[PDB]
A paper describes a structure:
To discover the molecular architecture of PexRD54, we determined the crystal structure of the effector domain of this protein (residues Val-92 to Val-381) at 2.90 Å resolution. Although PexRD54 could be crystallized alone, the crystal that gave rise to the best x-ray dataset was obtained from a sample including both PexRD54 and ATG8CL after co-expression in E. coli (see under “Experimental Procedures”). Although SDS-polyacrylamide gel analysis of dissolved crystals showed that both proteins were present in these crystals, no electron density for ATG8CL was observed. Five N-terminal residues (92–96), the residues in two loops (248–250 and 331–334), and 11 C-terminal residues (371–381), which include the AIM motif, were not included in the final model due to poor electron density in these regions. The structure of PexRD54 includes 16 α-helices. Our structural analysis revealed that PexRD54 includes five tandem WY domains that pack to form an elongated molecule. This is a conformation not yet observed for RXLR effectors with multiple WY domains. The WY domain is a conserved structural unit consisting of three α-helices and two characteristic hydrophobic amino acids, frequently W (Trp) and Y (Tyr), which contribute to a stable hydrophobic core. Interestingly, in PexRD54, the C-terminal helices of WY-1, WY-3, and WY-4 are positioned such that they also serve as N-terminal helical extensions to WY-2, WY-4, and WY-5 to build four-helical bundles as observed in AVR3a4 (42), AVR3a11, and ATR1. Finally, PexRD54:WY-3 does not have an N-terminal helix and does not form a four helical bundle. This correlates with a significant kink in the PexRD54 structure between WY-2 and WY-3.
Numbering used by the authors: 97 to 247, 251 to 330, 335 to 370
Write the structure that this text describes.
Amino acid sequence: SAEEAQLKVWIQSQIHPRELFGVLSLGKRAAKLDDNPDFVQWLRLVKDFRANNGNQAFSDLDIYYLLLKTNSPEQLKLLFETLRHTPGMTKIGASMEKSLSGNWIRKALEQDTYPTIVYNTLRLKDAGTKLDDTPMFRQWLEYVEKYWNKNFFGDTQMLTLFQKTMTEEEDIIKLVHMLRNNPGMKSHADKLERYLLLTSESSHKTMADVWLKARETPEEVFRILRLAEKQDDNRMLNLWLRYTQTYRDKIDKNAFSDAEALQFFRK
């Protein structure tokens, strides 16, 4: 058999699966079992390479983060389901699904493990701009929320991890504004939004575009910036007024005018 002999060649050669993944150009297309015999063969090599060298030689996460570069978390979830229910592939599919299930928070919670450590046990830096779509990231948000309700790990240190995961500020801003949707994080996200706005001029234009795309009301933004608290020489006030006029221009035509906004602020 042509496929059976090719597999032998790779095994005898001791070629590393990352190297083979590259030369077979499996990054150029969807990781599916249909119309992709090169991928199926690649899995067969991975299987054998693990048996002969141990799982750490090419881990679940090595596999996950390689495929994540050119497939979505949702595709990979369905992929591992299919492997778990394909004869010959059941062991590895189940290994992957176990590695991505979340069955570590209870045993790791009580243990009192620093989120930073867990963040890099999970190798979330390797997720890149896909971070906020990965299930493991969502799981880590659970372990942080629970770690806080116990007893120290702070909002700035969380932001540091995000910045060592992806380089572009626009990606960092969209990420933090997506955390608003997670209630219980909404508190800390809003704080990070302010921290960026007070430490980076480039953030202002980007942040205003993110709110505008999300159709956020002037009232909501006023709430994020916490302008009701104690403070015409105020950078945050100017920013809010500029967002408000953009909102009035692009979305409502009937929101706060300049005068009305200033009145709202006086309260």
